[PDB]
RNA sequence: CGGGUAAACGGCGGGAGUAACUAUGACUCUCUUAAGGUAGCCAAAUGCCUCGUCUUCCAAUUAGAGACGCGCAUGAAUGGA
RNA sequence: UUCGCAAGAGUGAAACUUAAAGAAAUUGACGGAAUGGCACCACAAGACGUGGAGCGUGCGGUUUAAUUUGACCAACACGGGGAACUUUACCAGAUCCGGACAGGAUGAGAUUGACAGAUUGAGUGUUCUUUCUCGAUUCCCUGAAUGGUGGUGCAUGGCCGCUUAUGGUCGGUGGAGUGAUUUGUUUGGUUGAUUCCGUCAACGGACGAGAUCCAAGCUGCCCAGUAGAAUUCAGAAUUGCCCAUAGGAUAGCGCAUUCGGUCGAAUUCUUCUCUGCGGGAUUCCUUUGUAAUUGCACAAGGUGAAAUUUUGGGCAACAGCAGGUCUGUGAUGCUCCUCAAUGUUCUGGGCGACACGCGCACUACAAUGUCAGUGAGAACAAGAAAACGAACCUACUUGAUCAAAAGAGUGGGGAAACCCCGGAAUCACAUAGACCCACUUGGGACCGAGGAUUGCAAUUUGGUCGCGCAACGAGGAAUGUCUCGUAGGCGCAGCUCAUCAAACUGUGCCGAUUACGUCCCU
RNA sequence: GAUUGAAAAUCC
RNA sequence: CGCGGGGUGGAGCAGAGCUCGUCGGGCUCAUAACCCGAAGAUCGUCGGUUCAAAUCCGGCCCCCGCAACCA
RNA sequence: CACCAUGUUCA
């Protein structure tokens, strides 16, 4: 069958991405997205 | 020239491989003869090697006996046992 | 120990070994036993092969990172298995969770996604730097869950193959047995047939066989504006004396033939065609046949479109098989993996790599041929699209003031309407055509240069010019299939399918030899 | 290792 | 010591030949038997001589022998 | 009346 013979890795284990927490980011802030529906995170507009 | 006859005189093979450990080899090839030694028997008054090897006999055995047998070169009225 | 010349005879243990050894019946199975049948998956008589060559494909080895795997008569163009990606199950990587749900640790920052720069094979937030954006959807770890073309077809379902193409199979009640078991289900004839007839310790049944069924013939009703015909009125074309190159043969002797564009009108009809139900064949009829000496039948001939299961199919009892399939499935039991996954996606490679062996194909070895013309001619079929047409198939034109392969345009067809009057290839030709017995204008293996086209991808597939000096001149031992519209030859369609049939499932075309037997072989 | 239903054998 | 003899496909053997073996394909459910095919020895060795050498002739190197005597 | 041998162990 598909034996789990395991695998040797030539690279380090890439970490799981974690969202950066900006406590009270609203207090810190600023340009409003010009895009009608919307760097602008919503439209990725640079 | 063609037959017969060995209780006529006499004669009576070699090499190579092979079993689920290893040996050795039932087995198989191959060369060969007139026939390739049968039954027996043996280091025998017959064996070179040889004071063969094992057992037995002695404190000690190139001796004796019983085995064994690749028998220089045992063997059937050249009579064998 | 006794006896014997001997050979031996008489007497006669044990140690140790071992779960059976035997005996008679029954049912199978087997026989280089007998008997009667039967089958070109057997043979006889044949016919076309195969095995020899090139090439396609499958299988095995060899190799490889991986060259995924099943299967070994009844595996080997089989898995509908013609794999560019996908498929794909294999290999080198890289994503996602598609871990529901419950309990924790969080938390209106739980979270989600990201531009750029580099990470990388990746103008892959994949992860990072970096800030944005999303918002209770999700994270975290604990059990759990889930998926798997993971395993095991020797755990199974279902299906298929095979036994097993033949005539087989099983109760009941009665009879016979101590019983397993037997009789019915017997033998004789008959038959493809456990098909009938006769017989009968059986008598009644049930299933297979046959019947039914679906196509091919022949025919009745129906039927046509998705099928045809024949007339009649026009419109037209040829029109007579006509003798090839050398020009044979082969009907014609009120009213000469032609013209699916002449897109002609009119009228009538169903010869062909369409097709739902009908019919038709039953050994029916006939032998101073065979048989019978009741029968059941049979052989010839007749009649007929068809004359014996009319023909080709389908269906097919009862037992089996550790046959195949856990790679068809939300068929599954038990197991294995499960978040750097045996899940899932994406990228690159493999499934097609070669010295070889084998199965099955396709093309050859030329003259009953090969080129190059002309002619006449089938059938089976398939066609376009979700949450107004467009994809699909076509004809015709053009490209064309100039190869093919293309590429355009314009129409038509949802398919008895278009394709289509379906110009299939075998085939024909008195074509006064080329070649002339050679591996050659036979044969195309294999390779070079250009260009097209399918496709996301061609490092696919046509077409053109080279190459041919690749074998191969008919194939040893062997060995397949086949009896009439058959073998063989020849095309065509469907299918898989973006592209690609030496495959298969159908279909028409042209059309033989032989046998009409037999148990030698199997 | 393959093989097998397990072994043996064989190859590997 | 002398005196001889003989050295060849993997094997046993001729003078490359034969037999067996080997390898490929049949035949078999398979194996053997069998059938059809393929390969495998410049011949102890070396040198000379010969057109040319397994051969001829030497020299070696083995094997096998046969003799190896006579108060 | 030519020849015509054999099938590892359990299951
Ligand atoms: K006595
Ligand atoms: K006695
Ligand atoms: K024989
Ligand atoms: K034996
Ligand atoms: Mg003797
Ligand atoms: Mg002696
Ligand atoms: Mg003494
Ligand atoms: Mg003595
Ligand atoms: Mg002696
Ligand atoms: Mg003597
Ligand atoms: Mg299996
Ligand atoms: Mg099985
Ligand atoms: Mg196929």
Short mmCIF file of N, CA and C (backbone and C1' of nucleotides) in Angstrom, two decimals, chain C residues 122-157:
data_model
loop_
_atom_site.label_atom_id
_atom_site.label_comp_id
_atom_site.label_asym_id
_atom_site.label_seq_id
_atom_site.Cartn_x
_atom_site.Cartn_y
_atom_site.Cartn_z
P A C 122 10.86 31.19 -9.41
"O5'" A C 122 9.67 31.56 -10.44
"C5'" A C 122 8.75 32.61 -10.07
"C4'" A C 122 7.33 32.11 -10.13
"C3'" A C 122 6.38 32.65 -9.05
"O3'" A C 122 5.87 33.92 -9.43
"C1'" A C 122 6.08 30.30 -9.32
P G C 123 6.45 35.27 -8.77
"O5'" G C 123 5.44 36.38 -9.34
"C5'" G C 123 5.11 37.51 -8.50
"C4'" G C 123 3.92 38.22 -9.10
"C3'" G C 123 3.19 37.46 -10.21
"O3'" G C 123 2.20 36.60 -9.66
"C1'" G C 123 3.68 39.67 -10.93
P U C 124 2.16 35.04 -10.05
"O5'" U C 124 3.00 34.32 -8.88
"C5'" U C 124 2.73 34.67 -7.50
"C4'" U C 124 1.92 33.58 -6.85
"C3'" U C 124 1.52 33.83 -5.39
"O3'" U C 124 0.31 34.57 -5.31
"C1'" U C 124 2.39 31.62 -5.65
P G C 125 0.23 35.94 -4.48
"O5'" G C 125 0.74 35.48 -3.02
"C5'" G C 125 0.95 36.50 -2.02
"C4'" G C 125 1.02 35.84 -0.66
"C3'" G C 125 -0.32 35.32 -0.11
"O3'" G C 125 -0.16 34.07 0.55
"C1'" G C 125 0.60 36.95 1.36
P U C 126 -1.21 32.89 0.28
"O5'" U C 126 -0.29 31.68 -0.25
"C5'" U C 126 -0.46 30.36 0.33
"C4'" U C 126 0.86 29.89 0.87
"C3'" U C 126 1.53 30.80 1.90
"O3'" U C 126 1.03 30.58 3.22
"C1'" U C 126 3.11 30.19 0.26
P U C 127 0.59 31.82 4.14
"O5'" U C 127 1.85 32.05 5.13
"C5'" U C 127 2.56 30.89 5.64
"C4'" U C 127 4.04 31.20 5.68
"C3'" U C 127 4.42 32.55 6.30
"O3'" U C 127 4.52 32.47 7.71
"C1'" U C 127 5.57 32.25 4.24
P C C 128 4.33 33.78 8.62
"O5'" C C 128 5.81 34.42 8.72
"C5'" C C 128 5.93 35.86 8.80
"C4'" C C 128 7.17 36.30 8.07
"C3'" C C 128 7.32 37.81 7.86
"O3'" C C 128 7.80 38.47 9.02
"C1'" C C 128 7.78 36.69 5.84
P U C 129 6.87 39.51 9.82
"O5'" U C 129 7.52 40.94 9.45
"C5'" U C 129 8.96 41.06 9.39
"C4'" U C 129 9.32 42.13 8.40
"C3'" U C 129 8.36 43.33 8.33
"O3'" U C 129 8.61 44.29 9.34
"C1'" U C 129 8.82 42.57 6.15
P U C 130 7.45 44.71 10.38
"O5'" U C 130 6.54 45.77 9.57
"C5'" U C 130 7.19 46.73 8.70
"C4'" U C 130 6.27 47.04 7.54
"C3'" U C 130 4.81 47.30 7.90
"O3'" U C 130 4.60 48.62 8.36
"C1'" U C 130 4.92 45.80 6.08
P U C 131 4.25 48.89 9.91
"O5'" U C 131 3.18 50.09 9.84
"C5'" U C 131 1.78 49.77 9.99
"C4'" U C 131 1.14 49.70 8.63
"C3'" U C 131 -0.38 49.51 8.62
"O3'" U C 131 -1.03 50.76 8.78
"C1'" U C 131 0.65 48.05 7.03
P C C 132 -2.54 50.83 9.33
"O5'" C C 132 -3.38 51.05 7.97
"C5'" C C 132 -4.69 50.44 7.87
"C4'" C C 132 -4.85 49.84 6.49
"C3'" C C 132 -6.07 48.94 6.31
"O3'" C C 132 -7.25 49.70 6.04
"C1'" C C 132 -4.17 47.83 5.47
P U C 133 -8.53 49.58 7.00
"O5'" U C 133 -9.52 48.60 6.19
"C5'" U C 133 -9.38 48.51 4.75
"C4'" U C 133 -9.60 47.08 4.32
"C3'" U C 133 -10.66 46.30 5.11
"O3'" U C 133 -11.95 46.60 4.61
"C1'" U C 133 -8.70 44.99 4.87
P C C 134 -13.27 45.99 5.29
"O5'" C C 134 -13.31 44.51 4.67
"C5'" C C 134 -14.49 43.71 4.85
"C4'" C C 134 -14.11 42.38 5.46
"C3'" C C 134 -14.71 42.08 6.84
"O3'" C C 134 -16.09 41.78 6.77
"C1'" C C 134 -12.46 41.38 6.77
P G C 135 -17.18 42.86 7.24
"O5'" G C 135 -17.96 42.13 8.45
"C5'" G C 135 -18.05 40.68 8.44
"C4'" G C 135 -17.20 40.12 9.55
"C3'" G C 135 -17.69 40.39 10.98
"O3'" G C 135 -18.71 39.43 11.24
"C1'" G C 135 -15.29 40.64 10.78
P A C 136 -19.23 39.08 12.72
"O5'" A C 136 -18.41 37.71 12.96
"C5'" A C 136 -19.02 36.46 12.57
"C4'" A C 136 -18.65 35.39 13.57
"C3'" A C 136 -19.61 35.19 14.75
"O3'" A C 136 -19.65 33.87 15.28
"C1'" A C 136 -17.53 35.91 15.57
P U C 137 -19.07 32.58 14.51
"O5'" U C 137 -19.76 32.55 13.06
"C5'" U C 137 -19.67 31.34 12.28
"C4'" U C 137 -19.12 31.64 10.91
"C3'" U C 137 -17.75 31.04 10.58
"O3'" U C 137 -17.86 29.66 10.25
"C1'" U C 137 -18.04 33.22 9.63
P U C 138 -16.93 28.57 10.98
"O5'" U C 138 -15.51 28.80 10.26
"C5'" U C 138 -14.31 28.35 10.93
"C4'" U C 138 -13.26 29.42 10.84
"C3'" U C 138 -12.04 29.24 11.75
"O3'" U C 138 -11.07 28.37 11.20
"C1'" U C 138 -12.87 31.43 11.98
P C C 139 -10.85 26.90 11.82
"O5'" C C 139 -9.24 26.75 11.88
"C5'" C C 139 -8.57 26.92 13.16
"C4'" C C 139 -8.30 28.38 13.39
"C3'" C C 139 -7.14 28.72 14.34
"O3'" C C 139 -5.91 28.65 13.64
"C1'" C C 139 -9.03 30.14 14.74
P C C 140 -4.55 28.27 14.41
"O5'" C C 140 -4.99 27.05 15.37
"C5'" C C 140 -3.95 26.33 16.08
"C4'" C C 140 -4.00 26.67 17.54
"C3'" C C 140 -4.25 25.49 18.49
"O3'" C C 140 -3.02 24.87 18.84
"C1'" C C 140 -5.64 27.35 19.09
P C C 141 -2.65 23.41 18.29
"O5'" C C 141 -2.03 22.69 19.60
"C5'" C C 141 -2.27 23.27 20.90
"C4'" C C 141 -2.94 22.26 21.80
"C3'" C C 141 -3.10 20.85 21.22
"O3'" C C 141 -2.98 19.87 22.25
"C1'" C C 141 -5.21 21.70 21.74
P U C 142 -2.80 18.31 21.90
"O5'" U C 142 -4.22 17.70 22.38
"C5'" U C 142 -4.53 17.73 23.80
"C4'" U C 142 -5.89 17.11 24.03
"C3'" U C 142 -6.35 16.06 23.01
"O3'" U C 142 -5.80 14.78 23.27
"C1'" U C 142 -8.14 17.53 23.57
P G C 143 -5.63 13.70 22.09
"O5'" G C 143 -7.13 13.25 21.74
"C5'" G C 143 -7.59 11.94 22.16
"C4'" G C 143 -9.07 11.99 22.47
"C3'" G C 143 -10.01 11.55 21.35
"O3'" G C 143 -10.19 10.15 21.30
"C1'" G C 143 -10.71 13.63 22.17
P A C 144 -10.14 9.37 19.90
"O5'" A C 144 -11.26 10.13 19.02
"C5'" A C 144 -12.63 9.68 19.09
"C4'" A C 144 -13.56 10.81 18.69
"C3'" A C 144 -13.93 10.88 17.21
"O3'" A C 144 -14.99 10.00 16.87
"C1'" A C 144 -13.28 13.02 17.96
P A C 145 -14.89 9.07 15.57
"O5'" A C 145 -15.05 10.10 14.35
"C5'" A C 145 -16.35 10.70 14.12
"C4'" A C 145 -16.19 11.96 13.31
"C3'" A C 145 -15.82 11.78 11.84
"O3'" A C 145 -16.96 11.51 11.03
"C1'" A C 145 -14.41 13.40 12.80
P U C 146 -16.95 10.27 10.01
"O5'" U C 146 -16.53 10.93 8.60
"C5'" U C 146 -16.95 12.28 8.31
"C4'" U C 146 -15.89 12.96 7.49
"C3'" U C 146 -15.27 12.12 6.38
"O3'" U C 146 -16.07 12.15 5.21
"C1'" U C 146 -13.55 13.15 7.62
P G C 147 -16.44 10.79 4.44
"O5'" G C 147 -15.33 10.74 3.28
"C5'" G C 147 -15.15 11.91 2.45
"C4'" G C 147 -13.71 11.98 2.00
"C3'" G C 147 -13.13 10.71 1.38
"O3'" G C 147 -13.42 10.64 -0.01
"C1'" G C 147 -11.62 11.57 2.99
P G C 148 -13.62 9.23 -0.74
"O5'" G C 148 -12.12 8.63 -0.82
"C5'" G C 148 -11.15 9.30 -1.66
"C4'" G C 148 -9.79 8.71 -1.39
"C3'" G C 148 -9.65 7.20 -1.58
"O3'" G C 148 -9.47 6.85 -2.95
"C1'" G C 148 -8.58 7.89 0.43
"C1'" U C 149 -8.13 4.64 -7.46
"C3'" U C 149 -7.31 5.46 -5.42
"C4'" U C 149 -8.14 4.20 -5.16
"O3'" U C 149 -5.93 5.14 -5.48
"C5'" U C 149 -9.30 4.34 -4.20
"O5'" U C 149 -10.28 5.25 -4.76
P U C 149 -10.73 6.54 -3.90
P G C 150 -5.03 5.10 -4.15
"O5'" G C 150 -5.44 3.71 -3.43
"C5'" G C 150 -5.94 3.75 -2.07
"C4'" G C 150 -4.91 3.16 -1.15
"C3'" G C 150 -5.02 1.65 -0.88
"O3'" G C 150 -4.36 0.89 -1.88
"C1'" G C 150 -4.85 2.79 1.17
P G C 151 -5.08 -0.38 -2.55
"O5'" G C 151 -4.92 -1.54 -1.44
"C5'" G C 151 -3.59 -1.90 -1.01
"C4'" G C 151 -3.70 -2.68 0.28
"C3'" G C 151 -4.54 -3.95 0.21
"O3'" G C 151 -3.78 -5.06 -0.24
"C1'" G C 151 -5.10 -2.68 2.15
P U C 152 -4.24 -5.91 -1.53
"O5'" U C 152 -4.92 -7.23 -0.90
"C5'" U C 152 -4.44 -7.73 0.37
"C4'" U C 152 -5.61 -8.24 1.17
"C3'" U C 152 -6.73 -8.92 0.37
"O3'" U C 152 -6.42 -10.27 0.06
"C1'" U C 152 -7.62 -7.51 2.09
P G C 153 -6.91 -10.93 -1.32
"O5'" G C 153 -8.52 -10.98 -1.17
"C5'" G C 153 -9.33 -10.20 -2.07
"C4'" G C 153 -10.50 -11.03 -2.53
"C3'" G C 153 -10.30 -11.79 -3.85
"O3'" G C 153 -11.14 -12.94 -3.91
"C1'" G C 153 -12.04 -10.28 -4.12
P C C 154 -10.58 -14.40 -3.54
"O5'" C C 154 -10.24 -14.27 -1.98
"C5'" C C 154 -11.27 -14.55 -1.02
"C4'" C C 154 -10.67 -14.57 0.37
"C3'" C C 154 -9.45 -13.66 0.58
"O3'" C C 154 -9.57 -12.93 1.79
"C1'" C C 154 -8.92 -15.87 1.21
P A C 155 -10.72 -11.83 2.00
"O5'" A C 155 -11.91 -12.67 2.69
"C5'" A C 155 -11.77 -13.06 4.07
"C4'" A C 155 -13.06 -12.79 4.79
"C3'" A C 155 -14.33 -12.84 3.94
"O3'" A C 155 -14.80 -14.17 3.72
"C1'" A C 155 -14.35 -10.88 5.23
P U C 156 -15.57 -14.54 2.37
"O5'" U C 156 -16.90 -13.65 2.46
"C5'" U C 156 -17.34 -12.92 1.29
"C4'" U C 156 -18.39 -11.93 1.72
"C3'" U C 156 -19.36 -11.44 0.64
"O3'" U C 156 -20.44 -12.34 0.42
"C1'" U C 156 -18.51 -9.59 1.79
P G C 157 -21.14 -12.45 -1.03
"O5'" G C 157 -21.83 -11.01 -1.25
"C5'" G C 157 -22.99 -10.67 -0.45
"C4'" G C 157 -23.50 -9.31 -0.85
"C3'" G C 157 -23.96 -9.16 -2.30
"O3'" G C 157 -25.27 -9.67 -2.50
"C1'" G C 157 -22.64 -7.30 -1.67
#
